[model samples]
Target chain A: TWEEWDRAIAEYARRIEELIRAAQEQQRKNE
Target chain B: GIVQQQNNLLRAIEAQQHLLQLTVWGIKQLQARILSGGSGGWMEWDREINNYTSLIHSLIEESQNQQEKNEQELLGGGSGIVQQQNNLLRAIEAQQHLLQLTVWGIKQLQARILSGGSGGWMEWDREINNYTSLIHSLIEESQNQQEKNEQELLGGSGIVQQQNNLLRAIEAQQHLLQLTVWGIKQLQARIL
Candidate 1:
């Protein structure tokens, strides 16, 4: 079931992490 | 200066509250299913949970659209508003995503009981624990963004008070998230 649940949200979770990292990179560039 | 930021934060807080309330309702539904000797009617429960999960999914997509608009505003690149607005919208969407994950996570357990009646609910709880961890991670990231924004704003200090107020609201939103996770944990233990 962990696997099942992972399948449901894995892509979404990754998408969020990328957005966070991208924002950080943008912040760094601005500074 | 921060009126728009404040409004976004207010909506973010409210959205998280809605998620917490939804999780509590779901915990009750699960309890009802497990209480009466774990008999039938799981189909009804499954359908309702699925619908609720879908509704949460709808919120996530809506927030994503709103985030896109925020990015568009950022492109014009004048207002400091976009940074915190982005963070708050992501927080809102993250919580919404989490509530959906919780709903979908529970559905895995529901599917188990729907068929055989036992032995698989534990696995479902494991992924929820994972999602709870994932959400906490997102909160930490948002806090980082918020603090960075706070400092940048303070350097200017044109809007420190409102930004100060916004930090508290972010904390409040995180607090709501904990309740949702707490309810699930309690339900997890209670289910056993």
Candidate 2:
């Protein structure tokens, strides 16, 4: 179902954003 | 009809992977620029970069999830469907590899930038240009695919539900590519 797929995709997107934020934090600390 | 939808989805996913690759490179370029004390037009670039990153991230997630669903649907259906699913999965997996590579590249670039190494900037510029060209070609292909899909829809020759889904998916992909092109232009104007 598209709904189920959308939910999972949204979850993954959130996870990706978290990872990106972590990367940004690491970049900040390295500077 | 389902097969056509799947093919369209595949093309859309390929376009997305190209855009995401470009987005990752663009973000790294901007990060290096800001770190190196370049800031005249960075504020706007930063906003657009972040915006497009989020957009691409969402697109990749959704496309992967959709592909997974399609694979599952074919799991118990038949050998041919399963085989097609496997091929699509392989393609999706390859995109995942490219995504990981881009992320790794960004990390490496960030580390180098932090260490105050400016020698690699030229190399990065060349790589960025290479990615930009590739993305442009991918976008053109995607546009052609979308046009073909639209013609098929107008001809009323496919499952309406599947066609709608494919159209929506392609529309989302087109939107992301447009955003990517805009970001690249901004980066080229400011950084190159």
Candidate 3:
């Protein structure tokens, strides 16, 4: 169960990374 | 209602502690990603990093203030309970200090990264690792303290059981909150 919780948090971190990537791409296109 | 109040407070403290632990680990992982050659994403990452640190700091203050108030109420009560509350308050205060130190370190690293310093990533990696270890140990200590509180409450009567149940329910609600936040973030990202 603890491992599951850890994985859940990791998934959240990954989601944030994806958002960062999207934003960065958008910034690059406008520049 | 007093029993209900105490249980809610305990639950709130536990949930905050648990979230803080998770946030520390998440920040470490995020830092590692930022260091792994993502300068294009650095600015966005820095903003998110600041947000997380600020959130953690506020959570720490909120929990510490709540616990301190609880301690004040417990004062002049049974010696054992008073001592336990005192210890928890001290632990919360210690955590608050640790988080402040960590936030300061993060700001320093942010400056280095923003200034385009050499080998800053390596320094940040090491710092993140140190902070992660510290937070891990703190989480363990908190878990132990929580278990001790549970045991103490367990051996008592009706009020104690109600308090325990209330705490457990609150913990479940907080866990759900985390999942909801994650889901909403993911959905928003997809839509954008």
Candidate 4:
């Protein structure tokens, strides 16, 4: 369960940069 | 006093620059996450990250503005050193804000993935985990540097400021907890 849990956490952490990029573009369009 | 102030200012600037580099890296990964999948919800995360980025960017701009004002003040009369310190504080605030938002975004993605949907949650989750680890490390490093600054550079002045920084850091942690709790609750609802 820890593996599964950490796996998910690790995955989410990794994708942060991608999420940030998405947020940046979205903010630009909003402006 | 001028040299000391300059040293502190330089350190603060370096810290802000480092945080910005991490933020940009996170932004790039976020883009990749969306491109990897034709997910409809890509825009949601995109909007959230960008909002924080813009906030920091504006804070940076404000710092520059104050720096300029300080320059003008220097020409007129009184302490330029304090002005530099103020700029450093603004940068610190921006960096803290970025860290907080980074945690929030990652938690949201984690929640989405656990819901076990047939979407790209897995992919997103991977990205989020990386972000969280990176940010957590950065947060630790920044905290250490803040302590060093308080001890060596700031002396007694660091007391009140350190307390304030601690409170802000706690606030960020609490926000992350709240997001995680809400996300897990949502997952529970879906399964039940």
Best TM-score among the predictions, by candidate number: 4
- CA deviation > 4 Å runs, candidate 1: A1-31, B1-119, B154-192
Writing each residue's lDDT as its tens digit, candidate 4 over B143-189 gives 66455554565323443343334333333433343344334334433
DockQ scores of the candidates:
0.23, 0.02, 0.03, 0.03
At residue B137, candidate 1 shows an lDDT of: 63
Residue B63 alpha-carbon offset, candidate 3, angstroms? 14
Q: lDDT of each prediction vs. the true structure? A: 0.48, 0.45, 0.44, 0.46
Candidate number with the higher TM-score (2 or 3): 2
Please give the lDDT score for candidate 3: 0.44
Residue B76 alpha-carbon offset, candidate 4, angstroms: 9.7
Chain A TM-score of each candidate structure, as shown: 0.56, 0.82, 0.68, 0.49
Clashes of each: 0, 0, 0, 34
For model 2, the local distance difference test gives: 0.45
Candidate 1 vs candidate 2, TM-score winner: 2
Error of 2 at B147 (Å): 2.3
Q: Candidate 3: where are CA atoms >4 Å away?
A: A1-31, B1-4, B34-77, B113-192
lDDT of 2 at B138: 50
What is the alpha-carbon lDDT for the whole of candidate 1? 0.48
Q: Which candidate would rank higher by DockQ, 1 or 2? A: 1
Scored against the true structure, residue B64 in model 2 reaches a CA lDDT of: 59
Give me the runs in candidate 4 sitting further than 4 Å from their true place: A1-31, B27-45, B61-79, B112-192
| Best lDDT among the predictions, by candidate number | 1
